[PDB]
RNA sequence: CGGCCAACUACGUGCCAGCAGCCGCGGUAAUACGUAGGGUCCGAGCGUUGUCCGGAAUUACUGGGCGUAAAGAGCUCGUA
RNA sequence: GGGAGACUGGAAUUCCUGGUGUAGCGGUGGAAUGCGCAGAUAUCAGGAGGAACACCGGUGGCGAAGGCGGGUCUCUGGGCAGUAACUGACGCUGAGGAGCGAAAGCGUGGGGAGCGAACAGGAUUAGAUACCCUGGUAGUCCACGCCGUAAACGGUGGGUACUAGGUGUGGGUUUCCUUCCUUGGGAUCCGUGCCGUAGCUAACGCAUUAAGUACCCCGCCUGGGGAGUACGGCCGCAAGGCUAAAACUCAAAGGAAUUGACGGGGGCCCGCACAAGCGGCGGAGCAUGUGGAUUAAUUCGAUGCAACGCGAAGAACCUUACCUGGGUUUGACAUGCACAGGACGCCGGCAGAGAUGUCGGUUCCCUUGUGGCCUGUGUGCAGGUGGUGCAUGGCUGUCGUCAGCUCGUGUCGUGAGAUGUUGGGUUAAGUCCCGCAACGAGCGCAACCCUUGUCUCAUGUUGCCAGCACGUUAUGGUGGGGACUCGUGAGAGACUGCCGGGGUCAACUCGGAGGAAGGUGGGGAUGACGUCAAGUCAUCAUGCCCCUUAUGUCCAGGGCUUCACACAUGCUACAAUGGCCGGUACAAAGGGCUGCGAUGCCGUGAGGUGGAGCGAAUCCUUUCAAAGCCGGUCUCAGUUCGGAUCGGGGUCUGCAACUCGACCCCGUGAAGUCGGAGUCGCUAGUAAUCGCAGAUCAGCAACGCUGCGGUGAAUACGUUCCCG
């Protein structure tokens, strides 16, 4: 075990806890709920890329707050999309529930998407050389990204052998806490067993 | 030790008695942390050779330390892939720690059924020069001596 | 010498053949042996080529040898085991035959480490 | 029909049965074994074995070498 | 110092003789055989004998090679320079052949001091046919002959000509500085070394003394073993030498160089690594884990550091994955395709160990198409703590919080690769400085974060109470008060900032001042590229394989707690620095709703009844401790120590304490007298010792783990040895 990880060694200086309420008897419960969301979210949306999962909780009320390099997708035109994620959350009995779907800004920038992309394109047919190189130059050409570093292991190209690469661009320091790194974990289905990809990126410091 | 020596402790005169020996021995006699104990240990012990002799018993407990206080120490010394046991000089300090190490565990064996009564006698002894403290600097000095042969390394 | 063997799963005669190779070593160690453990390990996967790993530990007055290998078979393993043991127990001896030769000795010759330094006088020699 | 050397997948088997000119392939997911689809090269032939030359500058005339890789006689005198 | 012969010198060793002279000498890492006390070793004088020739004496001379230095004489070989007088190609190489040829060895005859194969003892060792010690025969020496081999090597056949230089040194001729003393210097011939061009080479290297450029002649090689061996032959007194195969077998054997790893190689450094100390483990009893054995089963995983109070932060049932037996199969649990329905569902009765079975009571809402529920029939399917951590992801340990690991461009090399990253200094640090065919960069180091130590502003409740009032003992208890703590927000404060001295005037370093704190203040969090196919298919996920009337699933009972042993971590002791009894003082942190639970009362005590107040800076955990202090008693004993084991009697939780809980009371009173070889932790608020709390948790096997405070030492000379 070498690395803890990012988001958790920053957790209260640079980034933000992704549910926000307060419980004192209904901790547990609380909890149970949150995974059952954040579980139902995973699977039920994977065409558009899932950035991030917030929960805010208020008595009845719960906010929901997904977001999506694809919000076109997630939504109905008339709202059926939109009326199908109400009807099962209310099944969640999450009491009154009532969502906030987002847009990321520029999806290349984001470490969970870049990993989404690098495993689906592995998964196909993808080289992982390509795959790893295309994602990137592509976050390096965004005009906030400071270093990334890209990660997948496992039997890469449907060896007997497992191997471990990765590439750097840049400046990536995971020892420096001001420096914000956004990480970004997901594994790939291939034919012949499971490749994991993380991705690391730094856009400069925040005080 | 490897990058130098360490700086010491200056611990402080004793409040009773002002002088710098006595808290040595304290904290000599000293178990388990248990200081009050130790104080009391050896204020009896004192104030019982006191009794025994008639004088002061800071005087005594000097000369005790003098009559068992040693000079020369042997130590095994590693020259040319060979051990020989070499006798060597003694620091001042070395020489006191050692003194005062001795005093209080051939007190510890004695059998005057209490350790004040037995660090009591064990100084008093010292003092005439009787102690089986002042019977192992003799074996001390005895063995440096017999082995004198080596001091030249 | 006892020893005792800790095996696992299936491996009949292997403790009996490893405890009466092990315990011959016993004159070869130059010093006391405190203990000895011998345990024996099998692979289960069948593409393991050399499945069955052996391993020893003895307390030669303090001293750890330890050694380990690998085999087809107990048999094979443990004979293993005794060679790999009774080189490191050879290297091990620190005896004075063992040290004889490593001892600076040679007055004014070979440096070594703990070679006697030279007595220099405190005037250059001229 | 792994590479040399044109031409790959599936099923069966599992250090077996077997293959193999060399390197080497068989350890329940074999493009190297067996069989089927597909393919390639030849074609009234196609392969195997035996033998000779070539590749081999590997007996070097063309066209090699001898300090440490094999290779300067232990050193001289002197006959053809 | 080229060879042969003859004669001869001195030092030293050995022995013999004679003085003086005593009790050891000799030998080794350490000793013992051995010598000596019958006079040794030591010292002095004399004598005999043999062998080798210190200083000169070297990378210096001579010889074809082997090789050759005490001195003198005799005989003798070669080389070099100059003059060039003489002959006039008379040269070179040389198969076979002949001669010479270290040491060892062989023959015959001498000699024999020292040394010394063999051989004897001594020692070391598990064993020593060895290394080491004491003796010691051939041999070593001479004469005359055999042998004919060597790492006989420059691992380089002989002859000749040509191809940059620089610098030592040996022999000889000569011009010019000129003292002409002087290696003055030059030129030239002949040797002998070093460094270096061009060129050559796989590279290392060679390089006018070629391994370069060429010509003449000779010897030899044709993959590695078998094998320089067999057979035959020749030579030899013999040992043996020379010439010299094949069968068979392998897919290599080799040379140079590169990167690692390693060394009982060197250098420089570090770390409780050693040393200096303190306390332990190993001996006893018990708790816990493991091995082994046993059993129906003792579920599985973890095996040096880095497994073994580990997964387990809680095995009576459950857990539970194992065993015996009893049931069940679209299943204990999902979702879909169909047929039939209004019931599913509960509630009581009986049977059963229970699962389960059976009986009696209750019965859907949409809305006409059917949806929610189940029934069976099904059918897809579920379901595996089944296998493989050597197919995987994720997570983790470890080297190691060590300072290291790399990349772009450039340059060098045929290439693997190298440089940067090395050198001097410095640091905790690849930290920095100065240099430098390198210039930069990345991950690491450091900093940014938390906590702790000082102060300022803000701040007063449930927290303080200094100054005022009411208090009744019972106290901040109460009205009030910011003053002092404290609680939690903001900030300042340590930056070598300053001074003095060392320092390349550079890093850095020493000391001082100021300050709460001085030199990354203390402690955390943070773990580079990788390694060990390290651990984990049993948290989870997962490729492939396997089971599917079962390896799935339900239930009762049992097991995971078995015990002749072995290992590991702990606790309690073996006592007076103590046991026991009475009084008495000081903490922090944390926890609490179907939880903490007070006063009171009832029990001797676990405890019972009861419920105040508390989601808690408020109440409860008592107002909070124990070691501590004071007083009494015990008087060195297997005890007033020690508490194991066992008998009896209880309490609580729980459906249920038999296997198999904790606690209380009475009695019982084991081993144990400070623990072998060996081994562990710790550098200061640390070790040692004392108590308190939390998680898991109905209860607890908790002496375990994670925290909190109380009291509080000794020692560090220093890196030779052990470890990394």
């Known amino acids: 075990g070498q690395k803890i990880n990012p988001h958790g060694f920053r957790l209260g200086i640079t980034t933000e806890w992704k549910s926000r309420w307060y419980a004192d008897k209904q901790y547990k419960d609380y909890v149970k709920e949150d995974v059952a969301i954040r579980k139902l979210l995973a699977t039920g949306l994977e065409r558009a890329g899932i950035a991030d999962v917030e929960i805010e909780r208020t008595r009845d009320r719960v906010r929901v707050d997904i977001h999506t390099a694809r919000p076109g997708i997630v939504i109905g035109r008339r709202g059926t999309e939109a009326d199908r994620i109400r009807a099962d959350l209310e099944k969640l009995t999450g009491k009154q529930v009532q969502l906030n779907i987002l847009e990321v800004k520029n999806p290349e920038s984001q470490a969970q998407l870049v990993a989404q992309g690098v495993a689906e394109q592995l998964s196909n047919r993808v080289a992982f050389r390509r795959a790893m190189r295309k994602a990137i130059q592509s976050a390096m050409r965004?005009?906030?990204?400071?270093?990334?570093?890209?990660?997948?292991?496992?039997?890469?190209?449907?060896?007997?052998?497992?191997?471990?690469?990765?590439?750097?661009?840049?400046?990536?320091?995971?020892?420096?806490?001001?420096?914000?790194?956004?990480?970004?974990?997901?594994?790939?289905?291939?034919?012949?067993?499971?490749?994991?990809?993380?991705?690391?990126?730094?856009?400069?410091?925040?005080? | 030790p490897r990058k130098g020596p360490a700086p010491k402790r200056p611990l402080v005169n004793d409040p009773v008695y002002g002088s710098q020996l006595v808290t040595q021995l304290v904290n000599k006699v000293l178990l388990e942390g248990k200081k009050s104990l130790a104080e009391r240990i050896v204020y009896g012990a004192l104030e019982q050779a006191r009794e025994k002799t008639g004088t002061d018993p800071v005087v005594t407990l000097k000369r005790a330390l003098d009559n068992v206080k040693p000079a020369l120490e042997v130590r095994s010394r590693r020259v040319g892939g060979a051990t020989y046991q070499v006798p060597v000089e003694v620091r001042p300090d070395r020489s006191t720690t050692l003194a005062l190490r001795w005093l209080v565990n051939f007190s510890r064996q004695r059998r005057e059924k209490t350790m004040v009564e037995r660090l009591a006698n064990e100084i008093l002894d010292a003092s005439n020069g009787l102690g089986a403290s002042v019977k192992r600097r003799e074996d001390t000095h005895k063995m440096a001596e017999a082995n004198r042969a080596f001091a030249h390394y | 010498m006892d020893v005792d063997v800790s095996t696992d799963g299936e491996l009949p005669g292997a403790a009996e053949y490893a405890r009466e190779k092990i315990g011959r070593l016993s004159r070869r160690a130059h010093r006391p042996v405190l203990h000895a453990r011998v345990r024996l390990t099998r692979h289960g996967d069948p593409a393991v080529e050399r499945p069955v790993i052996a391993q020893a530990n003895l307390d030669v007055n303090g001293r750890q040898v330890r050694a380990q290998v690998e085999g087809v078979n107990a048999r094979e393993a443990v004979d293993r085991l005794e060679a790999r043991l009774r080189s490191r127990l050879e290297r091990i001896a620190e005896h004075w035959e063992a040290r004889r030769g490593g001892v600076p000795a040679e007055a004014g010759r070979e440096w070594r480490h703990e070679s006697e330094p030279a007595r220099r006088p405190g005037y250059f020699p001229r």
């Open chain 1, 142 to 207: 965004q005009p906030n990204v400071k270093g990334i570093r890209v990660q997948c292991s496992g039997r890469l190209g449907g060896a007997e052998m497992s191997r471990s690469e990765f590439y750097r661009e840049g400046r990536v320091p995971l020892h420096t806490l001001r420096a914000d790194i956004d990480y970004g974990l997901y594994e790939a289905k291939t034919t012949f067993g499971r490749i994991g990809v993380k991705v690391w990126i730094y856009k400069g410091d925040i005080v």
